[PDB]
């Protein structure tokens, strides 16, 4: 959760963003932050109010949404892996307390909104407060196991494990809407992987190497800039926005030289700093070993998956059967390789 970094890339270096279409990633192994997907499907999938459930009162919008999105990405040749967030770090707790205060005040407007009688505000502040549990991620990993599509459990941060997965070459690119994966160290970052059309949502492919080439920076330089735009792991300056962070990073290289040149009368310096441990955690988080995990996209199971998806969820079994048939049809097809792994780049060529 980085404040305005997408606007900074869209203003400074438009060549770093390659707005592609959903079928263009037809051979790429893709690591997905699964928590963004579960939060996307537990908010948008609604029918005028309550979350789309079964008759047992079990929340099951995220399973049907990930079922549709994941089979629509096997249809376009994406081989995904969903990386799940585990225990949050100690520096996450300040923004977690801020988000808990936001959900508490959203609970307060939900308390005064049920007595108001307005049904739009009730479903709106039900969309404002969603908390994922162990049971949602457990049935999410169960559906991924029954679809034959692998899941990875991060020890600290799923964006950090995604950026460690891309850096080890196990997957081509990280898939989150966040700019955290650029900070944690993924060279290629994908965005907006939904099931939509060409005009509606393009795929914002963020290349970190193009960002570091255009800004003239490297990995520890971009982390300090990403702190100065207000990351969740620390607190930025009140007087320094995006463009002033660009000018001060291009003036002072490390963040300690920014500490070595400030005035407290003009620029309000936040006391009790967290930037050293935030820099040491964005550079060096604790993650899983990506070389020790083999990624296999196996054949989807059929009868246990249809009894799991309809015996306790009361779902349209023909749509589930057609989705497993499309996953099994598109899984066994011949994938098309690229020319990036056959011929190597000897140098770029600009315009003159």
């Amino acid at each position: 959760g980085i404040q305005g970094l997408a606007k900074l890339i869209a203003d400074v270096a438009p060549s770093a963003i390659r707005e592609n279409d959903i079928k263009s990633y037809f051979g790429r192994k893709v690591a997905i932050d699964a928590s963004m997907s579960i939060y996307q499907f537990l908010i948008a999938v609604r029918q005028g109010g309550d979350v789309l459930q079964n008759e047992e009162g079990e929340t099951t919008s995220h399973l049907m949404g990930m079922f549709y999105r994941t089979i629509r990405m096997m249809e376009n040749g994406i081989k995904p892996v969903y990386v799940f967030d585990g225990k949050p770090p100690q520096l996450k707790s300040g923004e977690l307390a801020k988000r808990s205060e936001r959900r508490a005040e959203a609970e307060k407007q939900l308390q005064q909104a049920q007595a108001a009688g307005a049904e739009q505000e009730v479903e709106k502040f039900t969309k404002r407060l969603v908390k994922v549990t162990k049971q949602h991620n457990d049935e999410c990993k169960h559906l991924l196991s029954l679809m034959g599509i692998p899941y990875l459990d991060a020890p600290s941060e799923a964006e950090a494990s995604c950026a460690a997965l891309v850096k080890a070459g196990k997957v081509y690119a990280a898939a989150t809407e966040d700019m955290d994966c650029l900070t944690f160290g993924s060279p290629v970052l994908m965005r907006h992987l939904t099931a939509s059309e060409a005009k509606k949502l393009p795929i914002q492919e963020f290349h970190l190497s193009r960002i570091l080439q255009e800004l003239g920076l490297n990995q520890e330089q971009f982390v300090d800039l990403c702190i100065l735009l207000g990351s969740d792991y620390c607190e930025s300056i009140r007087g320094i926005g995006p463009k002033r962070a660009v000018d001060l990073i291009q003036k002072h290289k490390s963040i300690e030289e920014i500490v070595r040149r400030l005035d407290p009368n003009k620029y309000p310096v936040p006391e009790n700093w967290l930037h050293k441990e935030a820099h040491q955690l964005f550079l060096e988080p604790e993650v899983l070993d990506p070389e020790s995990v083999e990624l296999k996209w196996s054949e989807p199971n059929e009868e246990e998956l249809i009894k799991f998806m309809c015996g306790e969820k009361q779902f349209s079994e023909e749509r589930i059967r057609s989705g497993v048939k499309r996953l099994s049809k598109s899984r066994q097809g011949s994938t098309q390789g690229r020319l990036d792994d056959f011929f190597k780049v000897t140098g770029s060529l600009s315009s003159a």
Partner: protein, 255 residues
């Protein structure tokens, strides 16, 4: 400073007709050795390694190495203005924001001095090793266009099988299985209807059909298609222009 007078302008017209729909924006690498192009597809499957050497040009001179960025849809739309017998002169100057195309018909009087605004394009050049391809199939170009179109009528993949007796173009689709077989036609003397196959290892590879249909728009350049390929090596579709250079088309295999 870059003056490239080309008498047979139909060659450059057919090059841009071939290149208008595969790649949409290419960077022409102009050197003193000749006009070159090395640009990939937007989906990173196909590569257009185009060269046009300085010997076939009627009047070619360039002071330094130049790399203009050209919208190829725009260059095809401005090169459709020239006829099939126009002498086409490429003119670019110092700090070239525009490229001037001069179409002078020999028997007629039209001095068609067009200009084209260039593009701010930054693409990459890739080093191609001079590999010894195992199965090299020299065979007629309109036959290759017929094979690629009539197997794209069935499906989306052609499984090219090569052997000593001939090359087999098999395409599995929803209608059925179309196995186009060819024979080695070096025993029967023909002037251009010759399937000359130089095979070292029997290769059996699968290629796409949208990119092969994009490749077979280069068929009015020459009557020879040099299908150079090997096992897990990308296919080379070379259109050897008799005047200068060769239009080489690269294609990654399907797995």
């Amino acid at each position: 400073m870059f003056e490239a007078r080309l008498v047979q302008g139909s060659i450059l017209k057919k090059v841009l007709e071939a290149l208008k729909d595969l790649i949409n924006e290419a960077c022409w690498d102009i050197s003193s050795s000749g006009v070159n192009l090395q640009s990939m597809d937007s989906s990173h499957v196909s590569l257009v390694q185009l060269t046009l050497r300085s010997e076939g040009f009627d009047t070619y001179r360039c002071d330094r190495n130049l790399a203009m960025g050209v919208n190829l849809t725009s260059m095809s739309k401005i090169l459709k203005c020239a006829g099939n017998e126009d002498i086409i002169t490429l003119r670019a100057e110092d700090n070239a924001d525009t490229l001037a195309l001069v179409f002078e018909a020999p028997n007629q009087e039209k001095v068609s001095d067009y200009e084209m605004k260039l593009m701010d394009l930054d693409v990459e050049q890739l080093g191609i090793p001079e590999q010894e391809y195992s199965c090299v199939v020299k065979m007629p170009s309109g036959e290759f266009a017929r094979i690629c179109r009539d197997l794209s009528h069935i499906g989306d993949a052609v499984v090219i099988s090569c052997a000593k007796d001939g090359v087999k173009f098999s395409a599995s689709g929803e209608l059925g299985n179309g196995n186009i077989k060819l024979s080695q036609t070096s025993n029967v003397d023909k002037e251009e209807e010759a399937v000359t196959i130089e095979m070292n290892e029997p290769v059996q590879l699968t290629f796409a059909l949208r990119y092969l249909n994009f490749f077979t728009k280069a068929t009015p350049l020459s009557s020879t298609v040099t299908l150079s390929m090997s096992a897990d090596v990308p296919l080379v579709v070379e259109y050897k222009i008799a005047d200068m250079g060769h239009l080489k088309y690269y294609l990654a295999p399907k797995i």
